[PDB]
Ligand binder design. Structure first.
Ligand SMILES: COCc1nnc(N)s1
Length: 119
């Protein structure tokens, strides 16, 4: 029932994601010199270094907010991909499966801890 435990659990999951070769396209903001129309399609760029910096600055209040930003990394790639003949989109799908598999207990434990706090 530790209400704060999610933060270190998310730091560890982010470390696992950076170790994954599938995170390579998502470890830093998309370069607009490489993808000049990126902001014409993507309203809110997001990447794993930005998520980690937001977490470390103490600017997430819950793992649900972190999860929303991570899910935006994947939805941005889906929106920006022209077809399945994309190593980057295929990496996003595997990485998303890995993230969802690991974030589920973080979210459940946090929500359980908050319910216990207001029992
Ligand atoms: C992550 O770099 C920008 C891109 N996003 N989806 C692509 N298929 S290329």
């Amino acid at each position: 029932y530790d209400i704060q435990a999610w933060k270190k659990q998310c730091e560890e999951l982010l470390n696992l994601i950076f170790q994954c070769e599938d995170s390579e396209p998502f470890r830093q903001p998309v370069d607009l010199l490489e993808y000049p129309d990126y902001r014409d399609i993507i309203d809110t760029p997001m990447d794993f270094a930005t998520v980690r910096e937001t977490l470390e600055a103490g600017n997430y209040e819950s793992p649900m907010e972190l999860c929303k930003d991570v899910r935006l990394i994947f939805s941005n790639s889906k929106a920006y991909t022209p077809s399945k003949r994309s190593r980057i989109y295929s990496m996003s799908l595997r990485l998303s499966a890995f993230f969802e598999e690991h974030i589920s207990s973080v979210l459940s434990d946090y929500k359980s801890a908050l319910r216990f706090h207001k029992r």
